[PDB]
mmCIF file of C-alpha atoms and ligand atoms in Angstrom:
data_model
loop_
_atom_site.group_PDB
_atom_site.id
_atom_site.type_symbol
_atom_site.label_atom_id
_atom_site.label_comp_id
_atom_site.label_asym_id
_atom_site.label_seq_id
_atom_site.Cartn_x
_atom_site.Cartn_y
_atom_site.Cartn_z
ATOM 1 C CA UNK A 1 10.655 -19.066 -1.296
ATOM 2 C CA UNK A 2 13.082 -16.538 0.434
ATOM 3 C CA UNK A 3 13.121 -17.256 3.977
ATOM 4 C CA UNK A 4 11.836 -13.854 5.673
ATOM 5 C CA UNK A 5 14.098 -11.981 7.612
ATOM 6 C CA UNK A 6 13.002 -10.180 11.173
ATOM 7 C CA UNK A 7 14.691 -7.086 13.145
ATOM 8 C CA UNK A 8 14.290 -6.119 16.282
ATOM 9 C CA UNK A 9 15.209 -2.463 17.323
ATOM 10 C CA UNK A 10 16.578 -2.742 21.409
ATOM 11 C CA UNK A 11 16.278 -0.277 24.066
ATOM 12 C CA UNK A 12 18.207 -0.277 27.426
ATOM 13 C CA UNK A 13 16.281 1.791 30.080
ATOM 14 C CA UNK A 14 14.356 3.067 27.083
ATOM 15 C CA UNK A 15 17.650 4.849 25.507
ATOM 16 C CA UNK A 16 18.483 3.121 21.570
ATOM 17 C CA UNK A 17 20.676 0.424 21.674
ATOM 18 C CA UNK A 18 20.946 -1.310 18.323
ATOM 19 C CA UNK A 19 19.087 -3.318 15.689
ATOM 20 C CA UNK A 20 19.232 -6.853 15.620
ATOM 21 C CA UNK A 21 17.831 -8.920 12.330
ATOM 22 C CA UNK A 22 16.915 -12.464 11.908
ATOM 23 C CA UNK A 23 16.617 -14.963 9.273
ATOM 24 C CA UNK A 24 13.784 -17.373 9.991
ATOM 25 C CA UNK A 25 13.864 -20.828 8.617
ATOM 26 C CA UNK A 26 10.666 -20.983 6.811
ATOM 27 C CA UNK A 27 11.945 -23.553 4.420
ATOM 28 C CA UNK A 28 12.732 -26.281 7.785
ATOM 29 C CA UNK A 29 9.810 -25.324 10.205
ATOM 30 C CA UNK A 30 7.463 -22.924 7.788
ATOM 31 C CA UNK A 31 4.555 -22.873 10.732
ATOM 32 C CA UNK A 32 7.195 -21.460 14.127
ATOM 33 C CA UNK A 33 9.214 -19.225 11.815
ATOM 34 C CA UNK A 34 5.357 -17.797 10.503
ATOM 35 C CA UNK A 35 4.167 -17.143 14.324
ATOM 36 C CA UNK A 36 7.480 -15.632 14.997
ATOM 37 C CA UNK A 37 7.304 -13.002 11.483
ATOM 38 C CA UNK A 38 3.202 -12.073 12.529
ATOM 39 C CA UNK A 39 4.504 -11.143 16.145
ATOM 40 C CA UNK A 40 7.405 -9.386 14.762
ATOM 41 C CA UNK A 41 4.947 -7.230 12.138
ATOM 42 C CA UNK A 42 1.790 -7.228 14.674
ATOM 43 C CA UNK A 43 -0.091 -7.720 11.953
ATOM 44 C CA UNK A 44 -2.510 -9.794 13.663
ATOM 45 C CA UNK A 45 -2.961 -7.404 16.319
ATOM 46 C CA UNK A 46 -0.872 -8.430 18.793
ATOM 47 C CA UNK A 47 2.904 -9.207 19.122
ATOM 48 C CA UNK A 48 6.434 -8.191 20.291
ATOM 49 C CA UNK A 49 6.384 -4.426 20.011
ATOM 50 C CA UNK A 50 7.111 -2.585 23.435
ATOM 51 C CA UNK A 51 7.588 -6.355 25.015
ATOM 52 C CA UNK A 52 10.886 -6.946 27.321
ATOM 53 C CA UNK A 53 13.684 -9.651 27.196
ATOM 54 C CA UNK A 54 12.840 -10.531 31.055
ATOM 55 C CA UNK A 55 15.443 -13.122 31.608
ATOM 56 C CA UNK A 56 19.641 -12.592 30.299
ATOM 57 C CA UNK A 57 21.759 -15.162 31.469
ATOM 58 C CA UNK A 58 25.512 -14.202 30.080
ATOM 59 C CA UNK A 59 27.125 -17.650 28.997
ATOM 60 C CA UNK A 60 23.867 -18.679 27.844
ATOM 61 C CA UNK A 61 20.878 -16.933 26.409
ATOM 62 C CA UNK A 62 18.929 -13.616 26.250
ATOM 63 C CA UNK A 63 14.914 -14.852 26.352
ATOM 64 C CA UNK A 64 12.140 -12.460 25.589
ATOM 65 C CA UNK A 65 7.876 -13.158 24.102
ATOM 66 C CA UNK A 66 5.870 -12.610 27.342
ATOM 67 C CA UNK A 67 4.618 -9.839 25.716
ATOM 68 C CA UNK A 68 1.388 -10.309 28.183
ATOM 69 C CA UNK A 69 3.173 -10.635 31.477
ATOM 70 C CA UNK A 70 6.759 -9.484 31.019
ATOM 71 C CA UNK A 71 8.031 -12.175 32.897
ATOM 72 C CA UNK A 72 8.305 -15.420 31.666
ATOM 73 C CA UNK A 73 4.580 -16.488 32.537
ATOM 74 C CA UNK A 74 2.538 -15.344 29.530
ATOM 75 C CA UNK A 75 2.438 -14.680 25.417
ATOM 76 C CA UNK A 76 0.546 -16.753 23.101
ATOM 77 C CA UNK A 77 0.839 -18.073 19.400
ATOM 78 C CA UNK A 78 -0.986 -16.467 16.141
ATOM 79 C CA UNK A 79 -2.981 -20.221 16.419
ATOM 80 C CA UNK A 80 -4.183 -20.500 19.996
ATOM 81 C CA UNK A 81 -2.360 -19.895 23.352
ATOM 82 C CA UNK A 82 0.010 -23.234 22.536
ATOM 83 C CA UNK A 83 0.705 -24.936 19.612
ATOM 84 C CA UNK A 84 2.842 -27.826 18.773
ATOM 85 C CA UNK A 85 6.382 -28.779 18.399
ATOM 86 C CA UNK A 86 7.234 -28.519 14.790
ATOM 87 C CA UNK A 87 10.385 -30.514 14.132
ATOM 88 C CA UNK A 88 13.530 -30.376 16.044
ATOM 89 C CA UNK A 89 15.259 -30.593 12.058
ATOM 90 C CA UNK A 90 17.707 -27.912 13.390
ATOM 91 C CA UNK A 91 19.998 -28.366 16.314
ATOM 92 C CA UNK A 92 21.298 -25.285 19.124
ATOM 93 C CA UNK A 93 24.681 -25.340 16.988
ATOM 94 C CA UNK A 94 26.625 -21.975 18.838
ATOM 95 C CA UNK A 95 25.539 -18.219 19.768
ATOM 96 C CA UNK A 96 22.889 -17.073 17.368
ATOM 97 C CA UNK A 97 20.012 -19.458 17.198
ATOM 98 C CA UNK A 98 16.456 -18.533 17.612
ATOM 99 C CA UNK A 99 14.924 -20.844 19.601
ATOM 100 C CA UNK A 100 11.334 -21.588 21.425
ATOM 101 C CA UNK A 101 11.034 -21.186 24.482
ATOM 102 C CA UNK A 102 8.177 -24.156 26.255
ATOM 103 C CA UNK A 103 6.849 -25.424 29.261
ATOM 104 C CA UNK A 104 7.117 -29.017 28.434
ATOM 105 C CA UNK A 105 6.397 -30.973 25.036
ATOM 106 C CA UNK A 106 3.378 -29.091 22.356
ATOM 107 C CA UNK A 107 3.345 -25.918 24.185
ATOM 108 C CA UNK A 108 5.278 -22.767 21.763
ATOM 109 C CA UNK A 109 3.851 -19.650 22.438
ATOM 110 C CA UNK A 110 5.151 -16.395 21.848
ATOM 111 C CA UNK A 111 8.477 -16.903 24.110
ATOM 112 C CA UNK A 112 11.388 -17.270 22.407
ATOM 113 C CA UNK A 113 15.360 -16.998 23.007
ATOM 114 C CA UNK A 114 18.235 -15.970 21.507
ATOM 115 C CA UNK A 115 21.269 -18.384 22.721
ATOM 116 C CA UNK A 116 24.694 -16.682 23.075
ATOM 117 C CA UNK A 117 26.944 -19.867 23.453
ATOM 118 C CA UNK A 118 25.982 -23.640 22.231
ATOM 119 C CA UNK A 119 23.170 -25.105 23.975
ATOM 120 C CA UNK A 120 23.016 -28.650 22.770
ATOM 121 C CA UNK A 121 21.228 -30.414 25.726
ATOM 122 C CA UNK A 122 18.084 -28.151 24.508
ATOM 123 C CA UNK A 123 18.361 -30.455 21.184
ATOM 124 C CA UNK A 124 14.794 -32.162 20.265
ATOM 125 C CA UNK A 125 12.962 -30.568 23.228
ATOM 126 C CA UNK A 126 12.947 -26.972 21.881
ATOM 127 C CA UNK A 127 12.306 -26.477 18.120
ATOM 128 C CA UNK A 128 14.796 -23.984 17.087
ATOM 129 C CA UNK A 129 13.998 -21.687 13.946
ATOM 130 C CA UNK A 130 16.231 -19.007 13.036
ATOM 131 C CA UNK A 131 19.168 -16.983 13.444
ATOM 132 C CA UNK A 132 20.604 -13.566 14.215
ATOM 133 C CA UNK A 133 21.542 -12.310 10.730
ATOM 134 C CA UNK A 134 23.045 -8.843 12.019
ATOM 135 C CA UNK A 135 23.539 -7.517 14.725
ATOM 136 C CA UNK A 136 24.745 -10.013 17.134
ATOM 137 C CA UNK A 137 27.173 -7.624 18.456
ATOM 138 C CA UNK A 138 24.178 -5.932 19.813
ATOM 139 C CA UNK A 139 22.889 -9.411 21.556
ATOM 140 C CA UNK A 140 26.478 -9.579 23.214
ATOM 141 C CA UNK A 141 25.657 -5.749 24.094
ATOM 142 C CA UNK A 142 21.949 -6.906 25.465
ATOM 143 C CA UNK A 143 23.904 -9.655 27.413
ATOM 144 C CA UNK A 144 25.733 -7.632 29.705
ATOM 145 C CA UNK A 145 22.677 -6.750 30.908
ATOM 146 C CA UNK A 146 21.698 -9.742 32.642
ATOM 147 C CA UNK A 147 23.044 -11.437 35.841
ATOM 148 C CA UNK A 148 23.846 -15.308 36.806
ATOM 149 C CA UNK A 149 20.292 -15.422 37.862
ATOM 150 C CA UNK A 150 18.814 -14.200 34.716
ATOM 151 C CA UNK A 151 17.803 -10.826 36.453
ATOM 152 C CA UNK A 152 18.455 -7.549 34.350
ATOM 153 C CA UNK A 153 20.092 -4.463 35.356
ATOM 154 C CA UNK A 154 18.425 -2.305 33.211
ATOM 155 C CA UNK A 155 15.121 -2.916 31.286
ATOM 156 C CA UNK A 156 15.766 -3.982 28.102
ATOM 157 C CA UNK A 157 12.924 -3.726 25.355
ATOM 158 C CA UNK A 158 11.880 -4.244 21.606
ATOM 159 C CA UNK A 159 11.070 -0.387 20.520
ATOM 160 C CA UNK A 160 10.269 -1.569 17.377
ATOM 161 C CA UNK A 161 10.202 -4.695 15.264
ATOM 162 C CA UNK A 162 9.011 -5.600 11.997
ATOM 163 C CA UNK A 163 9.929 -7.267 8.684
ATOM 164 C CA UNK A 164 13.174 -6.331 6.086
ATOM 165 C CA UNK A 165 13.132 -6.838 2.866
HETATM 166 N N1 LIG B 1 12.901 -22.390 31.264
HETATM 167 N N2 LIG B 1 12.472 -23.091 30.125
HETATM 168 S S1 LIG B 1 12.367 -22.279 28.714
HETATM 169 O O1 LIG B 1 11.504 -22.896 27.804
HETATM 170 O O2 LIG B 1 11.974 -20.941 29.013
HETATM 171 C C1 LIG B 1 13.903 -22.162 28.234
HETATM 172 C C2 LIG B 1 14.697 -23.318 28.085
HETATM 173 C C3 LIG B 1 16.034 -23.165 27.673
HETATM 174 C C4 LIG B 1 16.559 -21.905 27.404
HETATM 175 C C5 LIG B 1 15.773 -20.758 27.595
HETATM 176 C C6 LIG B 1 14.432 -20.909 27.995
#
């Protein structure tokens, strides 16, 4: 009945960076914000842990969840390599919101971004499902780490990830 709450703990070329937490709407779209907690805790034996944010576009997004091929290409759901879209309920408001990354409509993974300005021409096609509690001073940190073209300039990784009380 409390929606769970997520952190992430970010390396830069492997050197400690900061923690950043998440609440995840569980009470809007109970099924994405479940797939995203399970990767987060690895408690079904796979997940987020060690896994890069590949592409950092400042202006726009950090985007991370290929934890299979670290580039944009792989990660799958806790149900299946795709499952559906939710609801679109919630709306890319400002910096902050958790969203899924897809490849077109029914097809959430693992891949997932973190927007750092509003994004509302993403509105209905990706089902957004949380938010950066704390930390998003370490997301505008991550951020300067990425390039027009969404390259990094240093590898950025979750060294650890779980869930707070
Ligand atoms: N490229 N399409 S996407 O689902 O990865 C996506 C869309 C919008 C923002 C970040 C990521």
């Amino acid at each position: 009945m409390v929606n769970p709450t997520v952190f992430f703990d970010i390396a830069v070329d492997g050197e400690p960076l900061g923690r950043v937490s998440f609440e995840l709407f569980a009470d809007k779209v109970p099924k994405t914000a479940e797939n995203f907690r399970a990767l987060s805790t690895g408690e079904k034996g796979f997940g987020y842990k060690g896994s890069c944010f590949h592409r950092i576009i400042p202006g726009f997004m950090c985007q991370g969840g290929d934890f299979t091929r670290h580039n944009g290409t792989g990660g799958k759901s806790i149900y299946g390599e795709k499952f559906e879209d939710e609801n679109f309920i919630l709306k890319h408001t400002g910096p902050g919101i958790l969203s899924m990354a897809n490849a077109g409509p029914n097809t959430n993974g693992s891949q997932f971004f973190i927007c750092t300005a509003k994004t509302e021409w993403l509105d209905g096609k990706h089902v957004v499902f949380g938010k950066v509690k704390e930390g998003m001073n370490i997301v505008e940190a991550m951020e300067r780490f990425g390039s027009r073209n969404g390259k990094t300039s240093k590898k950025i990784t979750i060294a650890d990830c779980g869930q707070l009380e």
